[PDB]
Write a protein that binds this ligand. Sequence first.
Ligand SMILES: [Mg+2]
Ligand SMILES: [Mg+2]
Ligand SMILES: [Mg+2]
Ligand SMILES: [Mg+2]
Ligand SMILES: [Mg+2]
Ligand SMILES: [Mg+2]
Ligand SMILES: [Mg+2]
Ligand SMILES: [Mg+2]
Ligand SMILES: [Mg+2]
Ligand SMILES: [Mg+2]
Ligand SMILES: [Mg+2]
Ligand SMILES: [Mg+2]
Ligand SMILES: [Mg+2]
Ligand SMILES: [Mg+2]
Ligand SMILES: [Mg+2]
Ligand SMILES: [Mg+2]
Ligand SMILES: [Mg+2]
Lengths: 84, 127, 115, 206, 100, 153, 98
Amino acid sequence: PRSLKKGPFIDLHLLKKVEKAVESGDKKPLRTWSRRSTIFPNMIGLTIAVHNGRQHVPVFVTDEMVGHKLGEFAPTRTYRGHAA
Amino acid sequence: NQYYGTGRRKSSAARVFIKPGNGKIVINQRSLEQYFGRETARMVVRQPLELVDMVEKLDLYITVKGGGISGQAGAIRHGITRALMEYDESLRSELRKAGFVTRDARQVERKKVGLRKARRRPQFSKR
Amino acid sequence: ARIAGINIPDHKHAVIALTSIYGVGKTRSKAILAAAGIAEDVKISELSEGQIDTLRDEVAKFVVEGDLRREISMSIKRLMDLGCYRGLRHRRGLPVRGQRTKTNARTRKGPRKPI
Amino acid sequence: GQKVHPNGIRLGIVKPWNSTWFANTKEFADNLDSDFKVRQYLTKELAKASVSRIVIERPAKSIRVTIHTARPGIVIGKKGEDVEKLRKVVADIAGVPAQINIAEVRKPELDAKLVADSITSQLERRVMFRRAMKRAVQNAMRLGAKGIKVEVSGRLGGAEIARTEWYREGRVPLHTLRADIDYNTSEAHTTYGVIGVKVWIFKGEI
Amino acid sequence: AKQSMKAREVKRVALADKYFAKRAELKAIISDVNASDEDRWNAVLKLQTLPRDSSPSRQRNRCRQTGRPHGFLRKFGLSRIKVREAAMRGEIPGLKKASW
Amino acid sequence: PRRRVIGQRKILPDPKFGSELLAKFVNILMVDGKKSTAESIVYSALETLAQRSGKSELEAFEVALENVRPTVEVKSRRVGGSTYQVPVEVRPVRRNALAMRWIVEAARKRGDKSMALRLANELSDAAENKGTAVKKREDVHRMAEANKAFAHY
Amino acid sequence: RIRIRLKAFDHRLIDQATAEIVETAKRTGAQVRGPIPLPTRKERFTVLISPHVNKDARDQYEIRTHLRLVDIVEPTEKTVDALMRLDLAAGVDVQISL
RNA sequence: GGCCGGGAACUCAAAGGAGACUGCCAGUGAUAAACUGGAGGAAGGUGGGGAUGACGUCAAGUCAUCAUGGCCCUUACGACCAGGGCUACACACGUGCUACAAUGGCGCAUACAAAGAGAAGCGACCUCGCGAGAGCAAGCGGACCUCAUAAAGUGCGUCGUAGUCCGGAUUGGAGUCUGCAACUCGACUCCAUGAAGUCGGAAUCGCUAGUAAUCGUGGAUCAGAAUGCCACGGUGAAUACGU
Ligand SMILES: [Mg+2]
Ligand SMILES: [Mg+2]
Ligand SMILES: [Mg+2]
Ligand SMILES: [Mg+2]
Ligand SMILES: [Mg+2]
Ligand SMILES: [Mg+2]
Ligand SMILES: [Mg+2]
Ligand SMILES: [Mg+2]
Ligand SMILES: [Mg+2]
Ligand SMILES: [Mg+2]
Ligand SMILES: [Mg+2]
Ligand SMILES: [Mg+2]
Ligand SMILES: [Mg+2]
Ligand SMILES: [Mg+2]
Ligand SMILES: [Mg+2]
Ligand SMILES: [Mg+2]
Ligand SMILES: [Mg+2]
């Protein structure tokens, strides 16, 4: 994990997008490629569409996902079993 | 006055000074029993003096560096055998008959490309 | 003889015997015994009942046994409900910490399943 | 099987290095690249002056280049005119004050680089390969070589199937470390592709 | 290597040279044992804004003659193949085949 | 080998008793070049053996060896698809080598706790024809006797 | 005192350089000690020789860095300048300490 | 405390030399080549190890190191970017690492190496942290400073043959560092967890001596990222009748 003395990481552009989204009141799904940004408390209730490699998947943020990374909720690999 | 001898074995080199005395052995400012605790190593060191029947007739001041326990003990016998023949040339034949005059030239074989060790080869499989 | 709701071996040294408690490894065992004034090479059999109550109070400061099991289960279950990659790896019984699965992974996958 | 490079294996025994400078790790790669650029420019700009060897020395914050040529006149030029331009470009490439020296190669038929270059130039002019090879071997043996081997490989005479052909006269004892073997190569860029040329010239033992 | 790949290398080196001082400043602050939590956090954010290619960890060592991104040797600035070719021609000073 | 340039390597006698045979025994017991460990095991076992037998270290060792040394063994020889176990004499150095190897192998499969105790027990048992080393000697002798007819091969 | 350190990849060359340096300090009447032959550095490089695969096919090379130390003990007022004019051979690295 | 004055002996450093030639002796042998043994010698018969790879063979490998004939694309088969993938996982194989313990595990104490690297680097001492580390900050472009206490070993204690005080996989929590950035997908630390495994079917591999086995150490690549590779010493066997 990122060192605590550095604080959590989040991309500046997504941080501004979220700040605007909380300000306008908006709930239009937020499009982002920042799988690496930490989910912050003010993200709760917003829908963030996180890129997984080919498509943005809607992630409705709850309290429990705070501290995680956005990419933890957009699986990149498609697997349905062998001999299926 | 002192009679000198240089002994070498593996990566070890020993400086042996002998003089008429009552059987003191000191290696690197420590007693023979303190420096070596392996019984094989004190015996090797003792091998030359207990062959020219002078266990207590010559004093022994020794320094040694390099290699480990067996290397340093062999370096010392070799260096005592060289000190004994400085004292008296007549016992050279008896020292050489025991194999003490030879410098054991066996050394660690280098590691080689494509081998795990000097000779150990990676496991082979036909298919 | 009985601590934290389980029986601990009477024939063993105290440090070893205390590790029978779910949640007490060697380090916690030494800490518990140091804080209860009890030596480490003391067999559990040759301990006064008062010393055993001291050990019980020391163990009480740590989360152990069923409480620890509930905590661990709650953490896994939270991960699994969350649907995160870690939780999905828990769901499928596959390695969770990024290990290779092309080969090995047999502790998570279990015995080989022939086609 | 594959053979060791005849020059490299002799590099401290009977053959000298072509670059002689000291450097620490900080400047070593830089000096290697600067030498490469200098040699590439001098090889391109003197392609018609039969240059066999470019020796580079870096005494102290400068570069000293010795050009080994069989035709020193075309390199020195009209009263130093040509070597002046070469020196200017070399000092510009190396970024340090440059000095260019000329060493004359007498008997160009006896040095491997020029022999290989002549063979490749002949091949690019569609000279029959056997003829160029045999003439190179004969000239070297007549001029006093103790031995010469010439090897040519590729689509010889435009054949679809590439092959290797070689001729030898005298002694070419490649396993003898003290043997003074002058070795060099050259490539011919024909309309059918690349033909490689290899020349070994034995000039006596020590 | 492709011409564009060597070009990417050149671009990365130039950008890292350009921004070395600014990045160094921003890091002894995100890092500092005594810096505002906003001043340290404002450095975390100005750091992402500087172009990615100004980070020296984006540079890949390449053979200076071919651009090969594998088998590099820092001492010679060349890949193994070009190192061997130059070594056999006596072009690397002091370097010769070794036995021991 | 095909050429035959192969000759004894010089063996240093053991420090305590000056026995080359005992030094070979230590070498046979040694694993991973850990000679001092093997020496400690051998000396402990010999001391226990002398206390149990009252003879001496070297004499008790010799008495154990004499009951395990084989005199005849079989060497396979293929003839017509069938292999002929041909009984051959065992030369003295190989008798000692086989006896020490069998004793060490027997002591390693024993159930006692330390290897020194297992080795002392094996040497005691062999001193009176009881251990699995003596059993292996008996099996080798009986296999050689069963093939006494095939002594020209 | 003056401490002259010399590095080279060839000993014949260094053994010639270190030696001029000494005279230039023994014509100005200045005392010197050594050359001290300091340990040689052997830098080794192991490379693959196929352009492709054949991991067991390798060349091993080495650059030997020879090192000599010559000390100037009490130097006349021409020592340095002379010293700083001998003009040693290319390929020798000369570092003069004071 | 080579610590100081000193000393140049010794270790060692590294330049130049000497030294091994079947040279000497005996025997065998075709008045040969040679072989068997002996002396002296540090070394004996190619002393040990390396480098060194004939003519060719397999249309063997490499057009993706590079180069290059021909062919093909050219507002795309070229170029730029962010995110993903190369890390997938019913499964089969190769090469390894760690084990299954008592010739061992753990604890305390305490010996003896070689080789190597270092300036956007190696980073001491001191302080803080259980620790990975952090802060401050010497010295060193090095036989000087740093990486950097070798480990096996030895002494003492304990465990007492148990799936264990063996093993250390997996997983939960808490962290460190590098790096714009560790979700996919880093290494490392701490607390907890404690899987399979009790020596491996048919089969099959390496090794003839400072070798095997075993034990640590270093380097390249490299911001970070070895159980791989390359290199270094320590301890140190067994056996070879024979074809
Ligand atoms: Mg991984
Ligand atoms: Mg190109
Ligand atoms: Mg990189
Ligand atoms: Mg002889
Ligand atoms: Mg040869
Ligand atoms: Mg083919
Ligand atoms: Mg291809
Ligand atoms: Mg891959
Ligand atoms: Mg354990
Ligand atoms: Mg490194
Ligand atoms: Mg160095
Ligand atoms: Mg089981
Ligand atoms: Mg068991
Ligand atoms: Mg062999
Ligand atoms: Mg290892
Ligand atoms: Mg690294
Ligand atoms: Mg080793």
